[PDB]
Amino acid sequence: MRVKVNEKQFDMIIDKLKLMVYEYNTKIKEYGVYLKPYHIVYKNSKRYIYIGKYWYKLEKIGGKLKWIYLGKTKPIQNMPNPPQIPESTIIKEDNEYIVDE
DNA sequence: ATAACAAAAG
DNA sequence: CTTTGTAAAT
C-alpha cells in the first residue's frame, strides 16, 4: 500500500498540489481565513506532510503572527470550495517521501 | 500580507 | 505510528 519515492520527482507532485492551494487562497483572500498549503509535523526523524488540509485564522497582534486553528472543513458556508487534494499519507525521511499513491 | 515544533487524539 | 494548537522567509 506504501511507496517510497525520490525527492526531486515527488516535489513536482507536491508543488503542483501546493499551487492549487496558493491559487485558492487568492480566490478567498477577502474571506479572512487561511487554508494552509503545506503543513509539517515532526516525529522520530520523520516529517508528516498535509497539503491543503488545515484551516487557520491568522491575526497579527503586537507585530507577531498568531495562528488560530479552525479545522479541516471550510469555515464559512457559501465561500468557494477548496481544491480536491489527495488525502493520502506523505512522510519525508532521508530525502525521500513515503507515499500511498 | 508561505515555509520548526509539541501533545492529544485517532 | 493525524488533528490540534504554538511559534523565518518571501
Coordinates of C-alpha atoms in Angstrom, one line a residue, chain A residues 3-97:
Chain A
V3 CA 5.6 3.7 -1.8
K4 CA 9.0 5.3 -1.3
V5 CA 9.7 7.9 -3.9
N6 CA 12.7 10.1 -4.7
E7 CA 12.7 13.7 -3.6
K8 CA 13.0 15.8 -6.8
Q9 CA 10.2 13.8 -8.6
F10 CA 7.7 13.9 -5.8
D11 CA 8.4 17.5 -5.2
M12 CA 7.0 18.1 -8.6
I13 CA 3.7 16.5 -7.4
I14 CA 3.9 18.4 -4.1
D15 CA 4.4 21.8 -5.8
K16 CA 1.5 21.1 -8.1
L17 CA -0.8 20.5 -5.2
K18 CA 0.5 23.4 -3.2
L19 CA 0.0 25.6 -6.3
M20 CA -3.7 24.7 -6.2
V21 CA -3.9 26.0 -2.7
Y22 CA -2.0 29.2 -3.4
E23 CA -4.4 30.0 -6.2
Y24 CA -7.4 29.1 -4.0
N25 CA -6.1 31.3 -1.2
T26 CA -6.0 34.3 -3.6
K27 CA -9.6 33.5 -4.6
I28 CA -10.8 33.6 -0.9
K29 CA -8.4 36.3 0.2
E30 CA -11.2 38.6 1.3
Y31 CA -12.8 35.9 3.5
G32 CA -10.1 36.4 6.1
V33 CA -9.3 32.8 6.6
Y34 CA -6.3 30.7 5.6
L35 CA -6.1 27.2 4.1
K36 CA -2.5 26.2 4.9
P37 CA -0.9 24.9 1.7
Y38 CA 1.7 22.8 3.4
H39 CA 1.7 21.6 7.0
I40 CA 4.7 19.7 8.5
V41 CA 4.6 17.7 11.7
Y42 CA 7.9 16.3 13.1
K43 CA 8.4 12.9 14.9
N44 CA 11.2 10.4 15.0
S45 CA 13.3 11.9 12.1
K46 CA 10.1 11.8 10.0
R47 CA 8.2 14.7 8.6
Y48 CA 4.5 14.2 8.2
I49 CA 3.1 16.4 5.4
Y50 CA -0.5 17.6 4.9
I51 CA -1.3 19.6 1.8
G52 CA -4.3 22.0 1.8
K53 CA -5.7 20.3 4.8
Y54 CA -5.9 22.6 7.8
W55 CA -7.7 26.0 8.1
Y56 CA -6.4 28.8 10.3
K57 CA -7.4 32.3 11.1
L58 CA -4.3 34.5 11.1
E59 CA -4.2 37.5 13.3
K60 CA -1.3 39.9 13.8
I61 CA -1.1 41.3 17.3
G62 CA 1.9 43.3 18.6
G63 CA 4.0 42.6 15.5
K64 CA 3.6 38.8 16.0
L65 CA 1.6 36.5 13.8
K66 CA -0.9 34.3 15.5
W67 CA -2.4 31.0 14.2
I68 CA -5.9 30.2 15.3
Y69 CA -6.7 26.6 14.2
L70 CA -10.2 26.3 12.6
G71 CA -10.3 22.8 11.4
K72 CA -10.5 20.7 8.3
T73 CA -13.8 21.9 6.9
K74 CA -14.2 25.3 5.2
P75 CA -15.1 27.7 7.9
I76 CA -17.7 29.9 6.1
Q77 CA -20.6 28.4 4.2
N78 CA -21.0 29.5 0.6
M79 CA -17.4 30.5 0.2
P80 CA -15.5 28.9 -2.7
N81 CA -14.7 25.3 -2.0
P82 CA -11.0 24.3 -1.5
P83 CA -9.3 22.2 -4.2
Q84 CA -9.5 18.4 -4.1
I85 CA -6.2 17.3 -2.7
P86 CA -5.4 13.6 -2.2
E87 CA -5.8 12.8 1.5
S88 CA -3.1 10.2 1.5
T89 CA -0.1 9.8 3.8
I90 CA 3.1 11.7 2.9
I91 CA 6.2 11.1 5.0
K92 CA 9.6 12.7 4.4
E93 CA 12.5 10.7 5.6
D94 CA 16.1 10.9 4.4
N95 CA 15.5 13.0 1.2
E96 CA 12.8 10.5 0.2
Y97 CA 9.0 10.5 0.5

